[PDB]
Amino acid sequence: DVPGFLQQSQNSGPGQPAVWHRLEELYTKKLWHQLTLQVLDFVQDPCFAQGDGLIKLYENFISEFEHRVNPLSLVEIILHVVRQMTDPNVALTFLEKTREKVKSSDEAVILCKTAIGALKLNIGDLQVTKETIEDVEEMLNNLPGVTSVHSRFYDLSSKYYQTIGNHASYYKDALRFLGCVDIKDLPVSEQQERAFTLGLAGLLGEGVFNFGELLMHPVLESLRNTDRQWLIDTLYAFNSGNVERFQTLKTAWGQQPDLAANEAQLLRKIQLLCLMEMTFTRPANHRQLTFEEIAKSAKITVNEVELLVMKALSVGLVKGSIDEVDKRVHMTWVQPRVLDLQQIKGMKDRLEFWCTDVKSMEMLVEHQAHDILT
Amino acid sequence: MVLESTMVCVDNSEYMRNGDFLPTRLQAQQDAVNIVCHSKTRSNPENNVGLITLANDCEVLTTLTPDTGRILSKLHTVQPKGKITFCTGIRVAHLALKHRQGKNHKMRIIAFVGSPVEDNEKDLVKLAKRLKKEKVNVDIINFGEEEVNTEKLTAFVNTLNGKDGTGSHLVTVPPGPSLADALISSPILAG
Amino acid sequence: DYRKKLLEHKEIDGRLKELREQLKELTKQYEKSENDLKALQSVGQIVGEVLKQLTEEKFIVKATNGPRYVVGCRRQLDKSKLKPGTRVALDMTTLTIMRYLPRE
Amino acid sequence: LHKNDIAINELMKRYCPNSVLVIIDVKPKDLGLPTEAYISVEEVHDDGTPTSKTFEHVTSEIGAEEAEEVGVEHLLRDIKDTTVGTLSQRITNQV
Amino acid sequence: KIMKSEVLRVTHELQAMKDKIKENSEKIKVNKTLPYLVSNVIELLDVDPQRKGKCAVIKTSTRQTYFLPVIGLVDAEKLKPGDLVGVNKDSYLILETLPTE
């Protein structure tokens, strides 16, 4: 079949014989790796998806009995086989045939089940695909923190975000996609929508209080100056606190779909933002505060502020319990979690002050103390 | 007899199982290690041989010892990963010569190169000047080709090779279904 | 030509896969021998019996051979079994208590 | 702590079990405790940065068993014991 | 047979294990050379709450009682309350038990 391959290798399209030249040269020189990289070039070429279907079977064969190269090349080309073919019925036989074919030398079975579950993330199945996704993250907690496989796992949790069940685990994995991005080589033209539903998904993730982790990471705000800055402004307001209800009102109605049923819960989230900011505002000098600034921050009545502080204690970001009879708001611990340069500088201020006070008392006791006691 | 230490640097890339050349010539050069270590054992049995790869994370597979019996075992479980690393493959042996027991054992390091070299000529002259500085007998054994075998590797050897009388030799093997074994046994380095 | 050699290679792989079991079972016994060799190094314990406890940590012991001593308490065990009426076990060094001695 | 110490550590993470690392000092001019136990564990990070071997401090104490106390105390004759009262309290209360 | 060529490393490991049992098996002969006296054994099972309880009660021929777990090698006809046993000097261990009559 090797001299029988020279016909259909030689006989080909108009522009393909340029890469059939080096493809037949590396084919005759029988270097499986250079032939492999030429296959990655030919799949990487935007071919017509018309005359490639025979070489899908041909280098599917040569890739099966080549028994040499890391078969993730075969994984990617067979993903392009099913992407060209759109036949999930034989795709399971293909992927299972690779599972029987790929022995245990390198555990690429995480990318196998990633591919299988990925194709099973069609409308046919959701639950057991999610369960074998849970198996994919369950398999290797070892040293391969390469995260290429695990950014493909983020693609699996993105198709799990196509299920409207969970905003949060897509956002928890979107922190991991926030950390596993390398450079801007992947499509800015894509990164518009990546940052767009990343921002909407960051908002609609309902297991979080802060947005300053997302806005803190600079590759997103450097990817969103291309984007229209109506959204960076309100994520900056949702990070830094809404002293207004008009701007967060206009973006509360700017995003039209699905935001009404979430909207009151988002009010319940951003009404905690002013709380944690106003208890992070005054470090000392009458830490005690009152409900009038809270309700003035929240345009809410005094009948609901007990419900508001009960909710704030119900989240558990604050431990403050107020011993008042006449209405007062005394606070304890909350987490800053975002940044404040004024608290960097005030940190240096009270920090240096504490240092020279402890030094002052140490010299003060120690001067007469060493001379009388030693 | 001949009092010297032997260091080998072995390829573990997937370029050593390619179906053009010998059927996993990793085995063939492993048997070349067997015949040169038993031939050095027959010449002077007290010569010590260390074993290490050219991967990213190189690992001393066996510390330098004249007991090659377990070196025969350590030549297996080769872990065919990675591609190549040239510089720390040199530095991982040439400075590790100073840990040796017999200080009268002279310095000899070879390397089995089955991948194209990733280092530029600027690093080739820093390392060739580095080894010609510390004066180690270095025999360069280059298996397989994608581009030409020696273009800058030639002047890498000539700038690496001082001491024109009985200095180091260069091994350049052509393609051939003949072995690597008797073909590298053709210079005086086997003998 | 071709169809026979996969079955024959199944037979060569058979005769190679049948020679490991003659070693891998008795290597458990061989490693078990040195597991025992690490188990026989715990030596030199003596016995004793508790009648009267003056300090809650440190009390009077009564040896089988006759001479009486006072001992301490080990940081691992607690005062449950250390109540009197309990025959115990002791060490030559430091007179410590590793565990007790149940009568029969 | 050099960059190489993950790889130097990795050899004894392989052949030995999970190995502990100790940073001590070449010159004991540090008034603080010279020994710091750094557990060799990989921890998952909230920023999304890929998982790497991370050296978290495990708290340490320096104790001697029996005879090391006797030999050290015989070698010194300079250190004083617990000695509650004025001096050993008030010197800690000095420095 | 490429998957079955990893068996060679396993066999070299196990014949290496047979190379290295010679020394720790060699100390069996020099530790277990002479059971110096004869001591009465009374078998008494213990409980530790592995941490399993396993014990025996010893009485020397000079009527001195000590403490020890069940120790020695793999025992089948042992575990009896019997006599004529193997013992080293102050280790007071069990090495070689024999029937008296």
UniProtKB/Swiss-Prot annotation, chain A:
Disulfide bonds: none
Domain of life the protein comes from: Eukaryota
GO cellular component, as recorded: cytosol; extracellular region; ficolin-1-rich granule lumen; membrane; nucleoplasm; nucleus; proteasome accessory complex; proteasome complex
InterPro entries tied to this protein: PCI_dom (IPR000717), PSD13_N (IPR054179), PSMD13 (IPR035298), WH_DNA-bd_sf (IPR036390)
Molecular function via GO: structural molecule activity
GO terms (BP aspect): meiosis I; proteasome-mediated ubiquitin-dependent protein catabolic process; ubiquitin-dependent protein catabolic process
Domain PCI positions: 169-336
This protein's UniProt keywords: Acetylation, Proteasome
Coiled-coil region(s): none
Residues modified as N6-acetyllysine: 296
Quaternary structure and interacting proteins, as annotated: Component of the 19S proteasome regulatory particle complex. The 26S proteasome consists of a 20S core particle (CP) and two 19S regulatory subunits (RP). The regulatory particle is made of a lid composed of 9 subunits including PSMD13, a base containing 6 ATPases and few additional components.
Functional description taken from the UniProt entry: Component of the 26S proteasome, a multiprotein complex involved in the ATP-dependent degradation of ubiquitinated proteins. This complex plays a key role in the maintenance of protein homeostasis by removing misfolded or damaged proteins, which could impair cellular functions, and by removing proteins whose functions are no longer required. Therefore, the proteasome participates in numerous cellular processes, including cell cycle progression, apoptosis, or DNA damage repair.
Similarity comment text for this entry: Belongs to the proteasome subunit S11 family.
Swiss-Prot record, chain B:
The protein's assembly and partners: Component of the 19S proteasome regulatory particle complex. The 26S proteasome consists of a 20S core particle (CP) and two 19S regulatory subunits (RP). The regulatory particle is made of a lid composed of 9 subunits, a base containing 6 ATPases and few additional components including PSMD4. Interacts with NUB1. Interacts with SQSTM1. Interacts with UBQLN4. Interacts with UBE3A. Interacts with UBQLN1 (via ubiquitin-like domain). Interacts with DDI2.
Protein name in UniProt: 26S proteasome non-ATPase regulatory subunit 4
Free-text note regarding domains: The 2 UIM motifs are involved in the binding to a multi-ubiquitin chain in a cooperative way.
All residue ranges annotated as the VWFA domain in the record: 5-188
Superkingdom as given in the UniProt entry: Eukaryota
Signal peptide: none
Keyword Amino-acid biosynthesis in annotation: no
Similarity field: Belongs to the proteasome subunit S5A family.
Keywords in alphabetical order: Isopeptide bond, Phosphoprotein, Proteasome, Repeat, Ubl conjugation
Gene that this polypeptide is encoded by: PSMD4
One MF term in the entry's GO annotations: molecular adaptor activity
Function: Component of the 26S proteasome, a multiprotein complex involved in the ATP-dependent degradation of ubiquitinated proteins. This complex plays a key role in the maintenance of protein homeostasis by removing misfolded or damaged proteins, which could impair cellular functions, and by removing proteins whose functions are no longer required. Therefore, the proteasome participates in numerous cellular processes, including cell cycle progression, apoptosis, or DNA damage repair.
Crosslinked residue numbers (Glycyl lysine isopeptide (Lys-Gly) (interchain with G-Cter in SUMO2)): 122
One cellular-component annotation, GO: nucleus
Swiss-Prot record, chain C:
GO molecular function per UniProt: ATP binding; ATP hydrolysis activity; identical protein binding; proteasome-activating activity; protein-macromolecule adaptor activity
Superkingdom of this protein's organism: Eukaryota
Residues with the N6-acetyllysine modification: 62
One GO term describing the cellular component: extracellular exosome
Keywords: Acetylation, ATP-binding, Cytoplasm, Nucleotide-binding, Nucleus, Phosphoprotein, Proteasome
GO biological process: ERAD pathway; positive regulation of inclusion body assembly; positive regulation of proteasomal protein catabolic process; positive regulation of RNA polymerase II transcription preinitiation complex assembly; proteasome-mediated ubiquitin-dependent protein catabolic process
Location of this chain's protein in the cell: Cytoplasm; Nucleus
Record-stated family: Belongs to the AAA ATPase family.
Subunit note: Component of the 19S proteasome regulatory particle complex. The 26S proteasome consists of a 20S core particle (CP) and two 19S regulatory subunits (RP). The regulatory particle is made of a lid composed of 9 subunits, a base containing 6 ATPases including PSMC6 and few additional components. Interacts with PAAF1.
Annotated protein name in UniProt: 26S proteasome regulatory subunit 10B
Organism (species): Homo sapiens
Residues of the full protein shown: 11 to 114 of 389
Swiss-Prot record, chain E:
Gene Ontology MF terms: ATP binding; ATP hydrolysis activity; identical protein binding; proteasome-activating activity
Provenance organism: Homo sapiens (Human)
Disease: Deafness, cataract, impaired intellectual development, and polyneuropathy: An autosomal recessive disease characterized by early onset of deafness, cataract, severe developmental delay, and severely impaired intellectual development. Patients later develop polyneuropathy of the lower extremities, associated with depigmentation of the hair in that area.
Keyword Nucleotide-binding (UniProt): yes
UniProt protein name: 26S proteasome regulatory subunit 6A
Included stretch of the parent chain: 53 to 167 of 439
Localization in the cell: Cytoplasm; Nucleus
GO cellular component: cytosol; extracellular region; ficolin-1-rich granule lumen; membrane; nucleoplasm; nucleus; P-body; proteasome accessory complex
Main location: cytoplasm
Example GO biological process: blastocyst development
Protein modification: Sumoylated by UBE2I in response to MEKK1-mediated stimuli.
Top-level taxon: Eukaryota
UniProt gene name: PSMC3
Family that this chain belongs to: Belongs to the AAA ATPase family.
Subunit-level organization: Component of the 19S proteasome regulatory particle complex. The 26S proteasome consists of a 20S core particle (CP) and two 19S regulatory subunits (RP). The regulatory particle is made of a lid composed of 9 subunits, a base containing 6 ATPases including PSMC3 and few additional components. Interacts with PAAF1. (Microbial infection) Interacts with HIV-1 Tat.
